[PDB]
Amino acid sequence: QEPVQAAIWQALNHYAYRDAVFLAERLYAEVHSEEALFLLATCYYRSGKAYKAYRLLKGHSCTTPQCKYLLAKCCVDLSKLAEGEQILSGGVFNKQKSHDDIVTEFGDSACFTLSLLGHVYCKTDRLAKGSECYQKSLSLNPFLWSPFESLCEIGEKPDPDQTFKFTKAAAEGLMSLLREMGKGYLALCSYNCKEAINILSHLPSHHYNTGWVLCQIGRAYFELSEYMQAERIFSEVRRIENYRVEGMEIYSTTLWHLQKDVALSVLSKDLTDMDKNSPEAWCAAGNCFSLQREHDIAIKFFQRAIQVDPNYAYAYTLLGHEFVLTEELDKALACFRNAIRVNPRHYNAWYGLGMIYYKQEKFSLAEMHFQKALDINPQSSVLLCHIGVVQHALTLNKAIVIDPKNPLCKFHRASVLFANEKYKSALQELEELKQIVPKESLVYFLIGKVYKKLGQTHLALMNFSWAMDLDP
Template sequence: MEAVLQERVAASLQQYMLPNATFLCERLCAGFPTEANKQLLASCYFRANQAFRAFYVLQGLKSPESRYLYALCCFQLGKLPEAEAALTGDHYSAGQVVNGAAGHYLLGLICKRSDRRETAVRHFSRALALDPLLWSAFEELCNLGAHEAAGALFGDSAVAALSQIYAQRLSEAGPRPATDSAAFQFPDLARMDAAATATPGFVTPAANGPSLVTPSVDTATPSSFTTPVMPGAHAPAAGRAGPSSTDAAPESTPARGAAVPPPVPGQRRKFVDEGKLRKVSGRLFSEPPLSSVRRSSRISAHQNASDASHSNGSGGEALPGGSRQDGGHHRGQRQSGSQNGDRGREQHEDDEQGATSARRGRRSESREDEAGAGPSSEHSNGDVSRAAVWLEGARQLLALLRQLGEAYRLLAMYRCKEAAAAFGRLPQQHYATAWVLCQVGRAHFEMVDYKEAERAFSWARRLCPHRLEGLDVYSTLLWHMKKEVELSYLAQEAIALDRMSPYAWCVLGNCFSLQREHEAAVRFFQRALQLDPHHAYAHTLAGHEHLSIEDWDEALTAFRAAIRLDARHYNAWYGLGTIYYQQEKFELAEYHFRRALSIHPGSSVLHCYLGMSLHALKRDREALQLLDAAIAKDARNPLPKFEKAAVLFSQDLYEEALAELEALKEVAPKEASLYFLMGKIFKKLDNPDKAMLNFSTALDLKPSNADVNQIKAAIEKLSVPDDGEGEEL
C-alpha cells in the first residue's frame, strides 16, 4: 500500500492536484510515518503555500533534503536564525552547506535580510561557483554592489563547474555495463576547446588528461590468421610473393561448433587463385567440404611436397605438364604414391583446416571481444559525443549569460548609457523579450530619457501583457510624464490580472498620486507592503506621498525602512535628503544627498540637490561646480540651470544670472519661480517696470498659495529698497 500511495501522491503533484496529493500523503504518513513520507507531506504543504504547516512537519528531520525544505519554510516565516541553523548544522566550520548551490543562495538571502552584506556576498559567490547558471545569485550580487565579484563570473571556471554538474548527473543516471576495459571517465570540459569546433563525436585527447579515443584493435596478427575470402573472390597475398605450387586445396569452412585446433607454429599459408585451381581440378567448388570428411587421427606434418603433388593424380587424371602412366611398375609406384598422396592431401587438408579453423576461431573471439567491448566503446564514444555537444551548448549559454550579466551589472552600477548599449548588442530574439526590455526601460528612466523608456516598457507590455514585475517603475515613469489616461488604464489592467501582486497596488498608488489623492495613494502603497513587506520601492513611494502632504515623521519612517531592506536604494537616500533640506537641516541633507550620489553618480537631479544644499551652507564655489556637472549630465533638466542662476544672483552676478534665466525661459516658459527670480534681478538692476512685468507673469501662472503670498509681498515692496527679500519660491 505504501508504494501505491507514494506513486499516486507523486502523480497528483505532477498534475498539480495539490489537495488530492495532500490528502493521500496524509494517509501515507498515518500508515507509514517514515522521514521520507513526512518530507513528501511537507512538500505538499509548501507547494500549497502553507509553509507554517510544513514547518511543523519537518521539525526534527535529519536528511539534507528535509533540512533544506525546513530552511525554506523558516525563511518564509521570518525565522532567520532557524533557517541558517538548518542549512549549516554541524558542518558550518567546514564550510559545508545543505543542498550545495541552492543552499548557499538561500544563506545569502538570509544574510542579506539580516544586514550581513559581506557574508551574503560570499555565499552568493559560492553558489555561483558551484552552479554558474544560478542567475538569481548573480542578480543579488549586482544589487548588493559586489560588482567585482559579479564581473568575474561566466568565465572558464564556469565551464569547469558545469562539467562537474554534467558528470554528476551522468553518474546518477544509472550504472554502466560492466566491461573488461577501464571505466569511462567524464572528460574535462575545460580542455575540450578543440572538440567544440571539430567533428561531433571526435575529441582530441588533452596533453595531460585521459585519452578520449577508443584504442584501435591490434592488427598485427600472425601470418596464418588472414582475412577470410568469400567464395568467388581472390584471396589477398598479404604482402607475400605469389605461390608457385599448385597443390593447395580450395579453402573450406569448418562446421559450426567444430573444435578449433591450435595454429601450427611457423606454418605459412599458401594461396592460389581461381584460375590455377581450375587448372588443377577442373572444378572449383565441387568437392565436399572438409568438415564432412571423417578422420580417425591427425597425420603428422612431415610429408614431402612431391607426395602432396600426387594427391590429384588418383583415378588416372592427367597431371599438368605430364602424360597418363599405366605401366605395372609405375602402377605400384602410383599406388604407393597415391597412398602417400592421400596421406599428404589429408595432412595438407588437416593443416589447412587447422589454419582456417584457428583463423575463424580468432575471428570469432575477435567478434566476441567486440561484442563484449562494443557497448562500452559505443557508450564511451556516445558519452564523448554528447559531452562535446553539451560543451558547445554550455559555452554558447555562458556567452549569452556573459552578455546579459555585463549589461545587468552596468545597470546595477547605474552606468545606464553603457548598460543600454550592452543590452542592445544582444541577439534580436533575446533583446525582444519582456525582461530585457524592462531593463532597457529602467536604464532610460534613470537617464531621464522618458520617451525611450516609455517605448521600451510599451514594447515589453505588448510582448508580455501578463507580466507585472517592473510595472512599479513603468507607472512612476507615466507619473513623471503626467499621462493620467495611460496610467489609469495600466492600473485597471494590473489589478484585473492579479489583486495579490504588490506591483499592481504600486501602479494603483501612482495613479491616485497623479490625481493628487495622496491619502488614497498611501493606502494603496501600504496594501502593496502587506503583500510583500520586503518591497523596498513600495516603501519609497509611500515616503514620497507622505512628503507631499508634509507628514515628515511618516516619510522618515518609510524611507528608513526602504534603506534597511536595500542599502543601495538611492531613491530613499534622496527622500531623506529632501526632508532634511525642507526642514533646513542642510548638513544632514548634504550627507544623505552624497550617499545617494555615491550610488548613482550619473544622476543630474542628485548633483543639483547636493549643489542646492551646499549653496544653503554658503559653499557657493562647490555648489556651482556641482550645478555645472548637473547641467552637463542632462542639458534638458531645467532645475540645475535655475539653481545656478540663483547662486549667481546671491553673488551679485546679475547679468550672468539673467542670461541663464533667459536661456531657461525657452525650455520652461510656464515656470512661475523663473519669472519671480527675473523680477527680483530687474529690481536689483533698477528696472521696476520689467520687474513688475515679471512679477505679474508669475502670478498669472497660478502658483501655490505660499508662492502667491511671496509674489504679492515682492510687488508691495517694489519701491522699497531690498532688505532680505532674496527668498526663493
C-alpha cells in the same frame, strides 16, 4: 511501496494535491521512513500550507538533507530566519559548519541552500556572509540567475565571465547569453545606464524582445530620465507579454512624470486586475492618484504595496515623496529611513531625506545623505528635482554662504533651478561652484547640459568630454 510514491509525484506534477497528500499520509503511517516523511512534508508544502510542513518535520526530528532543506525553506516562508540558519548552518549554537561541509552534506542541493543561506544572511544584516554564500552557490551551479542577481543589487561586483562557466554542449550557449546579460544587469545596477543599453541592445533579437530585457532597458532609459524613450519600450513589454507586472513598477512612475493621465489609469486598472498581491500594481494604482494629485487615496495604495511586500524598498520611497507634497515631513522621514533599512543602495530615499533636510536648512547632514546617494547614483538630482517640478506646477544667500564649506548641497540648489524653467539663475550659481570644486565630474556634466539647452552646441560638447575625462 515503490509504486505508491511514484504515483504521488504524478499527482503533484498535475497539482492534484488532495489526492497526493492522502496517499502520502497513508504511506508514512504504514512505513515511517525518512523518505516517506519527506514526501508527505513535500506534499503539505506544495499544497500551499508551509505551516503544516513545519510542524510535521519539526515534531519528530529528521536529519536528512532532503528534510533539512525543506524544513529550512518552510521557516523562511514563515519568517523564522534565525532558526532557518541553524538548520542549515549549524550556525550560532555550535560551530558554524563550512561551505565545504555544507556541500558535502547537501551535495547537489548545496546550490539552493547556499542561495537560501545567502538570502537570510542578507535579510538579517550580514551582507558579508550572504555575498560569500551567493558566490559559492554560483560556483556550484552557474544556471542560477537569482544569486547573481542578488549580488549585483547589494553593491557587490561579481565577474560575469568567471561566474557563468560550466566546469552536444548546450550550456556553453546558454552561458553566453547569460554572460552579456550579467554584464548588462550589473551595468544597470551600478548606474552605467548608457553601457547597459549598449550591452543589452547588442544581444540577439529573440533574446532582445523578451520582456525581461526590455524591462531593464526601460529602467535604464528611466534613470537617464529620457522619459519618452522609456515609455516607448514599456508600452512595448506590455503588448508583447501583457502578463508582466515586474517592470511595470517603474513604468507607472514614468507615466507619472510625463503626466499621461489615461495611460497610467489604464495601467493601474490592468495591473490591479491581474495581481492585487503585487506591490508593482499597487505602486501603479498609487501614483495614478498623484497624477490626479489627491493625496489621501494614493497613500492608502502605497500602503498595500508595503503590506503585500515589506521588503520592497521602492514602495516606501514613493510614499515619502507624496508626503512631501502634503507637507507631512515627519512621516516622510520615517519612510525614507525605512526605505534605507530594506535596501541601503536604493538612492531615491537617501536624497529624499537629504532634500527635506536642505529644505529645513540642515545642510551638513543633508550633505552626508547627498554624498552617500550620489555615490550610488550620479545624476540623481534630475529625477527627484523633476518631482518637485511636477508638484509645484499642479536664505538663498545663506545657503551659498553655507555652500562654501560643502559642494553637494549647493549642487542641488543648481539642479533645483534647472528643473524649474529658471535656466539663467542656474548658471550663475553653477560657476560659483565650478570654482569651489574642479574635481567633480558632476559640475562639468551640468555645464554640458545647461549649454545644450541654451543653444551653444560647441561649448556643451566641450565640457562633457572634460567631465568624462575627470570621471572614474
